[PDB]
From Swiss-Prot, chain A:
Family to which this protein belongs: Belongs to the membrane fusion protein (MFP) (TC 8.A.1) family.
Residues represented out of the complete protein: 74 to 125 of 383
Functional description taken from the UniProt entry: The periplasmic linker component of the MexAB-OprM efflux system that confers multidrug resistance. Functions as the major efflux pump for n-hexane and p-xylene efflux. Has been shown in one study to be involved in the active efflux of the autoinducer N-(3-oxododecanoyl) homoserine lactone, thereby playing an indirect role in quorum-sensing; but has been shown in another study not to be involved in efflux of this autoinducer. Over-expression of the pump increases antibiotic and solvent efflux capacities. Implicated in the secretion of the siderophore pyoverdine.
UniProt subunit comment: Component of the MexAB-OprM multidrug efflux complex, composed of six MexA subunits forming a hexameric tube, binding to a MexB trimer, which interact with the trimeric OprM outer membrane channel protein. OprM is thought to not directly contact MexB; instead, MexA joins MexB and OprM by forming a funnel-like hexamer anchored to the inner membrane. MexA may initially form a hexameric ring complex with MexB prior to OprM, then OprM undergoes a conformational change as it contacts MexA, allowing the periplasmic gate to open.
Triggers of expression: By growth under severe iron limitation.
Additional record remark: In both X-ray crystal structures approximately the last 100 residues are not ordered.
Cell compartments where the protein resides: Cell inner membrane
Superkingdom as given in the UniProt entry: Bacteria
Protein name in the entry: Multidrug resistance protein MexA
Observed phenotype of the null mutant: Disruption of MexA, MexB and OprM significantly reduces active efflux of N-(3-oxododecanoyl) homoserine lactone/3-oxo-C12-HSL/PAI-1, but not N-butyryl homoserine lactone/C4-HSL/PAI-2.
Curated annotation (Swiss-Prot), chain B:
Result of changing residue 41 to A: Abolishes complex formation
Shown residues within the full chain: 176 to 228 of 485
Expression induction: By growth under severe iron limitation.
Source species of the chain: Pseudomonas aeruginosa (strain ATCC 15692 / DSM 22644 / CIP 104116 / JCM 14847 / LMG 12228 / 1C / PRS 101 / PAO1)
Name of the encoding gene: oprM
UniProt name for this protein: Outer membrane protein OprM
Subcellular location: Cell outer membrane
Result of knocking out the encoding gene: Disruption of MexA, MexB and OprM significantly reduces active efflux of N-(3-oxododecanoyl) homoserine lactone/3-oxo-C12-HSL/PAI-1, but not N-butyryl homoserine lactone/C4-HSL/PAI-2.
Disulfide bridge map: none
């Protein structure tokens, strides 16, 4: 846990974040997925514009 | 015999001319598609130069 964000004993809205568990080994999967998304959008866009 | 061979070579060579005009049409369509794919970005400029040759 990097940070506790809620004030203790306070009313909590549905959807408010509470903690921040370490996003280290998960931001490195988001970049690995976002890179392949940025490469495979280009196949779809190039071929969608080029099938015409 | 010579007039007959001249007329037969004339007919056959204008048929050859028609087939080379049709091959020119197909090569022009293939270069049109390679120039289309070159603008978008799929084909590199090497395939564009090969289609142009």
């Amino acid at each position: 846990i990097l940070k506790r964000l809620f004030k203790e004993g306070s009313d909590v809205k549905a959807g408010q974040q509470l903690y921040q568990i370490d996003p280290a080994t998960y931001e490195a999967d988001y970049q690995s997925a976002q890179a392949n998304l940025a490469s495979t959008q280009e196949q779809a866009q190039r071929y969608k514009l080029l099938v015409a | 015999a010579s007039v007959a061979t001249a007329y037969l070579t004339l007919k056959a060579d204008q048929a050859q001319l028609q087939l080379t005009k049709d091959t020119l049409g197909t090569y022009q369509k293939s270069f049109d598609l390679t120039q289309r794919s070159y603008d978008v970005g799929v084909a590199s400029a090497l395939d564009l130069r090969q289609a142009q040759t």
